Each structure stands twice: as C-alpha cells, then as structure tokens.
C-alpha cells in the first residue's frame, strides 16, 4: 500500500542527498509488498549498496527498519564463516530474523535482510586463492543459495526449515580500492609520452563519479565472485557528500549533530547556538578529512572541547554562541550570562 | 507408459533455453532410470556432471526436472557439507532429505534422483587445519556415489548404489587451466602467433575441451571424477537465447514485470527492439541471464517510483532508447 | 584479536570481559567504557603481498 | 612463539607452563618468575613491509 514517494519521504527526513539509493530501496520495498500481496512466480531483485565512508548506507537501513512492517534484521559479514568453523554461521541470519517475527516462519520468509561490510569478505584477487578463505570467499559461497533461494535449518529456541526464495537481501559495503579498478578500465590512457593522457591529481575522475561507472567486471577484480554478483543484480551508488549536503546534515535531520550537542548542553542548563557561517566552515574542514559526514563530529568536538570542560564549573551561563572564527581557532566562543 | 526422452526435453524446453546438449544428457539418464526401475546382467548408472558458467541453466534444469518426474528428487548444496563429526553438516543428511520426499520409503528412495550444486566449492586447496569442507567431503561422497548402506534417523539403512547423482557447479578458473594445457604459443617473432585477444576462446568454447586431468588441477579427487563419467557442458549464453529468455519461458522477466504492473493497474508492453538491446547489455556484464534482470530494473526504476503517484495511467511502453537512457518510457492515459 | 574463524581471541571477547566486571548485567554493560591498547599493532604496514589475508 | 592467529604458538602459553609448576594455583603463579631464552631471535631484519610473525 505505501507508495515509494511516502517511503522516500521517511528516509529523506534522516538521509540527505542519496536520491538514487532512496529510489532503489523505495521501489524494492514497494515491490516487496506487491510481491507479498500476491501468493507466474514473481522473482526478487536483491540490492547492492556501494558507497564511500560516511555516505548513508547503514543509516538508510536503520531508517528503513523503523517503517518496515515486515521483519528487518541487519547482519554483518565479518562474523560469518564457512560451515564447520568456530565463527558464526550464515544461517544465523535467519535465526536472527525469527527473533523479530516472534518465531513465525511464514512471517520471516516475507522479510528483508541487510548485510553490512560485505566488502570485507571479498577475495584478495580476481584469481581463486590457493588457501581456504574461511572468512572471505567461503562466506560468499555459503550466501549464494541463501539469496537465490533454498531451505535453511534454524534451531527453535528438531529444526525449523525456513525458505529464502522470497526474502530480500540488501548487501552494502564501502568498497575501498574499487575506484582504482574502474580507473584502469575507464581511462586506458596512462603513459609518459605525448600520446599519453597525463592529468594532475586535481581535475581528474573522483571516487564518487568512478563508482557511478561500476560494472560487474570491476567488482570481479575487487574480489567478489561472479556467482555472488548475479544474486545481487541491482547496484545502487551513493555519492560523496558535498559541502552543501554536510551543511544540511548538521541542522535539517531530526537526529542531527547540532541537535545532539544542543540537547547535551540543554540538560546541563546551557543553550547552544550555531551561526550559519560556522556550519560552512565545519563542512570545509570535514571534506579534507575524507571520512564523510562523520568528520563533522571531529571538528565540532575539537571546537567545543575547552567549552565543555569549563562550563559545568561555570555558573550563571544561559547561552553559548559559536561564530566562524571559533572553528579556525582564532577566537573563543561568546558566553551570555543571566 | 513411461515417458520418452523427447517428451522430457519438451518439458525442459518450456523453462530452459539454449542447452540442447545437456538437455539430451539429462533426458537420456532420466529415461534410463525409469527403465532400471521397471527392471527391478545388472544395469549400471551413469552419474552426470554439469559444468557451465553463471546463469547458464544448471539449477534451473534440476528444478524443472523435479516438476515432471515421479521418483524422489532432492537438491543439496555442497557448501553446507562437512566431514563426519564436525558441526557443519553430514553427507548422509542428503538421504534424510530424500526420505522426506519418499515418505520414508526405502524401496522408493533408492530409485531416486539426487542433485548436488556448488560442487566446485568443495575442491582441494594447497595448505597442510584440516579442510573439513574440501577433500574430506569428497571422500565421504565417493562412498555415497559408489554405493553403500548409510544409517539415517527416521536408524534406517538406505542403499545408494542405484541412486543417481547429478553434481554440477560453475567451475571458475577451469578455463584458465584448460588454456594453459591447450592454448600454447606466446612467442615474440614474426613466425610466432600472438594472443590476439579478440580471437581468444571464451569459457564456453574452452570448457567443451575439458578432460578429467583438468578437474584434477582444479582441486577434485581423481576417484571422484571417475565415478562421474558423463560430463555435460553448457554454453555461456547466446544473445539470441537472451532475447528468448524474456518471451518464451513461462517465468520470464517480461511476464514477471507485466504481472507486477498488472496488479497495480497498468499494462506494460515491451518492444522487440528493446529486448535485443537488453540482451546486448546483459552479455557485456558476463554474469549470465541474471545480469539481465538488472538492466530491466534500471530502465524501469524511475517509472516504478513515479507510477503509483500517477493517476489515469493504463499502459506503459518501453522503446529501445529507454534502455540506453536517452529517452523516457511512453505512457498512455485513460 | 583476530578475524573470525581463526585461533586468536575473538573481538567479542572484549564485551565478555566487560560483563565480568558488570556481574553479567547487560543493561549495566551497554553503558560501559572500553580501552583498546596497542591499537597501532593492527595496522597493515604497507606494500605487502595481497595473496595472504591480514587476519591480525 | 608467534603472532596471534598463526600456527606456531601463542604468547600466553608461557603462563600455562608457569601454572603447571604452581599446581594451577593462580595466586601462587601471579607472583612467579619467567626466563625467556633466545630473545635475540625475535628481532627485525627499521619498519617491515610485511608482517613478521616470528
């Protein structure tokens, strides 16, 4: 019943700028409901979220779980291991899913699964490894039949046979080093001479733009096996957050960073005011860190460190103001007393 | 009377496309199985080995095969298997699954069919902890494939000398092995013959020349491959076949999306020109027919996102330009 | 510490230590502090063969 | 001795040997003495491009 526009609006409240990824998830979730409403067999298209650090992959999933009537779980690929080893088994994901559905098998098969840090199980090289990849390739192999569809045994609290042909899988990870792979395939003009195309570090293809030209052969060289990529046919890319986006992240979202510190200072008894000029400076410094939106927390804290250290001892403090200079370190935040 | 191989192939053709060689092999083996069942000299069973690239139709053949045959059919994944005594799974578990389909009828289960997918995932590595999921599983299967009594809880003893086994997997890297052995050259002079990448034989053309020694280098035990004398090879895919997968099969993508839009109140139409373009793109992805699903999704993403909001929409048409992204799909209102 | 499915202690073991000090009170352990010393010892040094997996 | 996660050995094994002499009395072992011989063998070669398990 819910339309993708409605779903994207819920995500837009918490996620800024990932229009393409919000469309894919909205459409997939809507199609999941459509496919769910009907009991010709309708196949499912699994998603693959590729984006840089601090782009909103895990955030999109968390925002999705809030509005998802069907069971949603969010697993991790690091803990997984090939069957027969001490590490957590791949089937545990299904067990985790049942916990959300009160151990209802019919309600679990209709679920959505998010797998984060999928890039951590990738093979080291394109060619098969000569040693057993317990936490890498082995996990990919075991996931194949899970995504496409098979029956899995789950210990209830005998085993419970849970099918996965209808379960949706959203495997997302920050593929680091994939941009280099794409550049080799897309540039093909490296060299030293005149005919060669020599460009500077600046004014060249960025990581965000390169991922937009991602194709399976690129992921193959990164380590993902061909069988695994076929299970995940829908590839959604998230671009690097621009300064304009970061400025919005600080105030527009409901659980924004500025609101977090305001709540902290408010329960303490102090008001916190961020001037518009300051938010533009924080974004500039953050981009330099190349850590995404998370970089904002590093700037803000360093700017209010001394303030937070001296404020509780201080008395009769009702408001704090942070102008652009405070970020640069050439000034001290202004304080207003009662 | 019992069905003839021609009839079996017709049933498979309804859901499978472009695997004439393997379809014959499976139909022949299945027909022979019924002949042995009626004749309950002792006839021997030929185990099958399905080798094909991703999205070629191996698992599909097995699923379609199960639908028409009466005898018990069980689908197993070699990944979950482990050496006896470990916590992953036991090889005899396969038989247990079989009995569920046979309702714990041994006489009806010994005459059954078994399929083992992802067989290439239990290969042998080059390290000296014990590879519980590799060589150990192969040795345990040898006993199962050759024929022996296995204890299964309802324990029950179930012979396996008569059970048929169809082990198939997408052997990746096997093409490289064959190329070394078969594609000699790489000189530097005038007389020498350079690679000439365009000329390079693709996996489909390269796997047809497979021999048992090739599988040895891939990591399979010799006794294992010997037990499986038959080797059915699948071509990667053909662009003509890709265009057929979208229209001829029962559960084709076009029919899926048409049903999707239909329950929503919209009739989706695909033009022949578009299907040719989608097939071309799919072949470039080198992920089989499954990659084809992505292209369709992308071309329809914007549409499916804005379709419910739209009102008085009775039909959607996808042109060749829509696939490339230059144009927007046309709509017809009511 | 080591990657999952290896001989070394698992990362989750840290939380176990926390529970021991918290008398296995999960509600009191989710509010704890953790200090991971020698964090420089888990860094890929540079320019090494990628055939092997840096599990440490 | 080798790095954690490798086939050779773990450094905690030393304490186990110490406990053997202490009859598995932790309080008696926590105040023990250890002699690590051949310490020169655990040495580099400056930084190292690859991991030195031993």
């Amino acid at each position: 019943l819910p339309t993708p526009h409605e779903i994207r609006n819920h995500l837009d409240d918490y996620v800024i700028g990932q229009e393409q990824a919000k469309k894919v998830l909205a459409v997939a979730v809507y199609n999941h409901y459509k496919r769910l409403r009907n009991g010709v067999e309708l196949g499912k298209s699994n998603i693959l979220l590729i984006g840089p650090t601090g782009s909103g992959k895990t955030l999109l999933a968390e925002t999705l779980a809030r509005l998802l009537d069907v069971p949603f779980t969010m697993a991790d690929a690091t803990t997984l291991t090939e069957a027969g080893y001490v590490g957590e088994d791949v089937e545990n994901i299904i067990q985790k899913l049942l916990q959300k559905s009160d151990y209802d098998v019919q309600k679990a098969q209709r679920g959505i699964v998010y797998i984060d840090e999928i890039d951590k199980i990738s093979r080291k090289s394109d060619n098969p490894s000569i040693t057993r990849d317990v936490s890498g390739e082995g996990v990919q192999q075991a996931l194949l039949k899970l995504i496409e569809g098979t029956v899995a045994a789950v210990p209830p609290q005998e085993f419970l046979q849970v099918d996965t042909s209808k379960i949706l899988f959203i495997c997302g990870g920050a593929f680091a080093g994939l941009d280099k792979v794409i550049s080799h395939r897309v540039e093909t003009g490296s060299g030293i001479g005149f005919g060669a195309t020599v460009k500077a570090k600046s004014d060249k293809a960025s990581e965000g733009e390169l991922l937009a030209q991602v194709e399976p052969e690129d992921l193959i060289k990164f380590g993902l096996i061909p069988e695994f990529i076929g299970r995940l046919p829908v590839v959604a890319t998230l671009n690097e957050l621009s300064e304009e986006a970061l400025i919005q992240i600080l105030k527009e979202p409901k659980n924004a960073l500025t609101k977090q510190y305001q709540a902290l200072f408010n329960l303490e008894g102090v008001d916190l005011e961020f001037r518009d000029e300051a938010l533009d400076a924080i974004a500039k410094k953050a981009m330099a860190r190349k850590t995404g939106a998370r970089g904002l927390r590093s700037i803000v804290e360093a700017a209010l460190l001394d303030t937070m250290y001296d404020l509780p001892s201080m008395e009769d403090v009702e408001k704090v103001v942070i102008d652009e200079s405070v970020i640069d370190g050439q000034s001290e935040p202004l304080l207003i007393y009662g | 009377a019992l069905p003839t191989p021609h009839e079996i192939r017709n049933h498979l053709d309804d859901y499978v496309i472009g695997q004439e060689q393997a379809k014959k092999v499976l139909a022949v083996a299945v027909y022979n199985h019924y002949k042995r069942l009626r004749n309950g000299v002792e006839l021997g069973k030929s185990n099958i080995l399905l080798i094909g690239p991703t999205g070629s139709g191996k698992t599909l053949l097995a699923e379609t095969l199960a639908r028409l045959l009466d005898v018990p059919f069980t689908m197993a994944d070699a990944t979950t298997l482990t050496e006896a005594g470990y916590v992953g799974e036991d090889v005899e578990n396969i038989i247990q699954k079989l009995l569920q389909k046979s309702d714990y009828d041994v006489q009806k289960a010994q005459r059954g069919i078994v399929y083992i997918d992802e067989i290439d995932k239990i290969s042998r590595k080059s390290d000296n902890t014990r590879d519980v999921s590799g060589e150990g599983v192969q040795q345990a299967l040898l006993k199962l494939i050759e024929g022996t009594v296995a204890a299964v809880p309802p324990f029950l003893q179930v012979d396996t000398s008569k059970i048929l086994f169809i082990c198939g997997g997408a052997f990746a890297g096997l093409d490289k092995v064959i190329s070394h052995r078969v594609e000699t050259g790489s000189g530097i002079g005038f007389g020498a013959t350079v690679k000439a990448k365009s000329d390079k034989a693709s996996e489909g053309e390269l796997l047809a020349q497979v021999e048992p020694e090739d599988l040895i280098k891939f990591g399979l035990i010799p006794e294992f491959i010997g037990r499986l004398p038959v080797v059915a090879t699948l071509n990667e895919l053909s662009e003509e076949a890709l265009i057929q997968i979208l229209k001829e099969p029962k559960n084709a993508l076009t029919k899926q999306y048409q049903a999707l839009f239909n329950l929503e109140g919209v009739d989706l139409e695909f033009r022949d020109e578009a299907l040719d373009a989608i097939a071309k793109k799919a072949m470039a992805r080198k992920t089989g027919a499954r990659g084809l699903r992505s292209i369709v999704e992308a071309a329809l993403l914007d549409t499916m996102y804005d379709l419910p909001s739209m009102e008085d929409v009775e039909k959607v048409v996808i042109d060749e330009s829509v696939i490339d992204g230059q144009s927007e799909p046309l709509l017809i209102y009511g | 510490l080591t990657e999952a499915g290896y001989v070394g202690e698992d990362v989750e073991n840290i939380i176990q230590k926390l529970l021991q000090k918290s008398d296995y009170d999960v509600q009191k352990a989710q509010r704890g502090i953790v200090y991971i010393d020698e964090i420089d010892k888990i860094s890929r040094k540079s320019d090494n063969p990628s055939i092997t997996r840096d599990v440490s | 001795l080798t790095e954690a996660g490798y086939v050779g050995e773990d450094v905690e094994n030393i304490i186990q040997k110490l406990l053997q002499k202490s009859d598995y009395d932790v309080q008696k072992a926590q105040r023990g003495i250890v002699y690590i011989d051949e310490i020169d063998k655990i040495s580099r070669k400056n930084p190292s491009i690859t991991r030195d398990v031993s």
Binding site: - | Y86, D127 | - | Y6
Partner: peptide, 10 residues
C-alpha cells in the same frame, strides 16, 4: 561436533 579454527601460516 567440533569447530575448527584455521591457523594462518607464513
């Protein structure tokens, strides 16, 4: 059964 822990070499 008994879980196996792979010990990396070299």
């Amino acid at each position: 059964g008994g879980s196996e822990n792979y010990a990396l070499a070299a």
